[PDB]
Subunit: 273 residues, 3 copies
């Protein structure tokens, strides 16, 4: 259980080149001193990260960022009794975005990717990016959403005008992910024959660079990288209605009903009932 | 109907210099090849953009940005009945600003300007800048506003203290303008006499660089540039009162009544009536 | 009363070097002309700023910046009568920070510091930094706060589900400080003997570089520097409950009860009572 730079672990080439000169120490006593005059030429691998998944390192933090104005309406009840009065429908085209960086890669050597869906729906519109395990990429996805607020029925007391403001709250969800998976496989190369020294075909596994305890059953080895994200997305649609005689304001959420969000038609009471 | 770089269109000097060498093709067959050995020297113009107006390319977007704290008050009713209790008056000096850039000029050659008033009043205080049609200028205007909230009468139930918070909502209105107008007039210059070549006084209109269809009646030609803006301005003044026994909060807008905004004196009910 | 660069005032070395050559004008008429061939070597001081205090140059400005989501809860009353229903407790670890710069030092020469506590408590958690009088330092202090919201009792009408959102308002308090205090003391040095010129041990006070009127009783002299700040801190904890039949939302402040803020357990009415 546990490991973070595939690249540092692949320096178990160091093992092949050392043990190599160690045999040669019998044939010539100054063997170790030739450490860098002897080149070691990689020629391939089947290195692979299995079941790459991104997951939440910590809980997400959420801030209510801004409110988007969506619409306005005066509704006028010049009657001696209370009336149901209909507001107009609105359309807001608003964009939900997320941007996602890899902060600590998992080594550079082996490529991998994994989708991550933003842990905040609240509208019916999900949002996904991905992370690259092996370089520090900033990827950015997004989605235009059209919120269709239909007419609302608003009870308005007698001799009251009423101001109706509608707005879409936005929320900014930030957090830290960990990139994880189970690395397998081997490299094969050659320590080419130098002067008196013999050629040496090699093949090391990554299993054999750590410890049989750290290693799993199935033979792979766990890796972790780091990554952050920051998304901005719609939350509730609010309708605030204000009675222009008393100036009291009452607040209402208009609930939800591709990339088109339709909202319920509600009947709601203005302050003064 | 339609055109965007006066400057590209003024390269109907190219027309005068070409047609010029075209006549000379009879007298000498290698005329076109002297295209850049022959200089063309402008000497004046009465180019002019008529009725320059800025106008809204798209609807404005509005975000409720921040709330400015304006004041606080505890109001205490240690009586066995409900009392009208007066809050203190406040003054807030707050600044409404707008900044405005030209994003795609209309060509560099001819100067023009046009005022633009920010499409959001909501306080009694308007805000205007302008755009330069011919260079990418950022201009910034602003206005200090002093909001004078008088004493408010607050009904407070028996044996209730009440906390009153007042604040000014700010709103951030951003959008895209288009700079428009009707260009007229001409340039006059000279293709000075070179070696065997004769001098050639010229005068071309801008009308004669496009197409009689695109041209208007009156003879001018329509132009468009681009421009954005971003203003931050006051919207409603809110008074929130909280009943300290139940902790319910009720919300109220205090309506409006040079660069001094006076607000109404309202009578309002604390939660608990 | 009044003074702002100790450093400009210490150029009453200029006084010692001038008056010095003024005596020499008798012995040789071209004395003033040697002004910079004569070196003046400081060797010490007991300069000191007494009772250094930071204080508020203007009132603070406060913006409600963002709301931190703290928790969510559905509470369901599938009974034919009204029920008290308990929400779950939450923990929010949130950080209150302040950053503070010195904008106009008070001269570079003499060191001093003074603590400044942020003029906004509202949680039970104060916040302090300091200012350096003599260089333009940005210092930043902060405090993790854990807000412990216990279970709340929420009256919920019959056949009503109810959504409960809890959030912590943050506020951004910015303003300008003035760094003040009463400077005392002296420098002593030497105008070393050059060619025909005699050595001259000196000791000037700072008192004797301005005017006996500006000077105080006790002999010191008032100084002022400038400095700004910007803190971000928690204000009220809000619980908003929404009745899912009518969609009305009522709002509530949950009042406060080291770096651990415990909150009251309230009994509150959902909309619909
Ligand atoms: U995991
Ligand atoms: U919700
Ligand atoms: U509100
Ligand atoms: U237009
Ligand atoms: U309004
Ligand atoms: U509120
Ligand atoms: U003072
Ligand atoms: U408060
Ligand atoms: U609210």
């Amino acid at each position: 259980s546990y490991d973070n730079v595939d690249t540092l672990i692949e320096k178990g080439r160091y093992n092949t080149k050392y043990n190599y000169l160690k045999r040669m120490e019998k044939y010539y006593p100054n063997a170790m001193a030739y450490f860098d005059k002897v080149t070691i030429n990689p020629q391939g691998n089947d290195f692979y990260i299995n079941n790459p998944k991104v997951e939440l390192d910590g809980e997400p933090s959420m801030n209510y960022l801004e409110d988007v104005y969506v619409g306005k309406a005066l509704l006028t009840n010049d009657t001696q009794q209370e009336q149901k009065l209909k507001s107009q429908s609105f359309t807001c085209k608003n964009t939900d975005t997320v941007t996602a960086t890899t902060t600590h890669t998992v080594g550079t050597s082996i490529q991998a990717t994994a989708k991550f869906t933003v842990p905040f729906n609240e509208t019916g519109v999900s949002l996904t990016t991905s992370y690259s395990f092996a370089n520090t990429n900033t990827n950015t996805n997004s989605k235009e959403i059209t919120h269709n607020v239909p007419s609302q029925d608003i009870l308005v007391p007698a001799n009251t005008t009423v101001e109706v403001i509608a707005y879409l709250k936005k929320v900014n969800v930030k957090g830290n992910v960990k990139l994880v998976g189970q690395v397998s496989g081997s490299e094969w190369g050659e320590i080419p024959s130098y002067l008196a020294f013999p050629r040496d075909g090699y093949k090391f596994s990554l299993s054999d660079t750590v410890n049989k305890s750290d290693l799993n059953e199935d033979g792979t080895i766990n890796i972790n990288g780091k990554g952050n994200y920051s998304a901005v997305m719609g939350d509730e649609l609010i309708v605030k209605v204000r009675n222009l005689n008393t100036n009291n304001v009452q607040e209402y959420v208009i609930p939800v009903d591709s990339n088109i969000v339709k909202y319920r038609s509600l009947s709601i009471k203005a302050p003064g009932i």
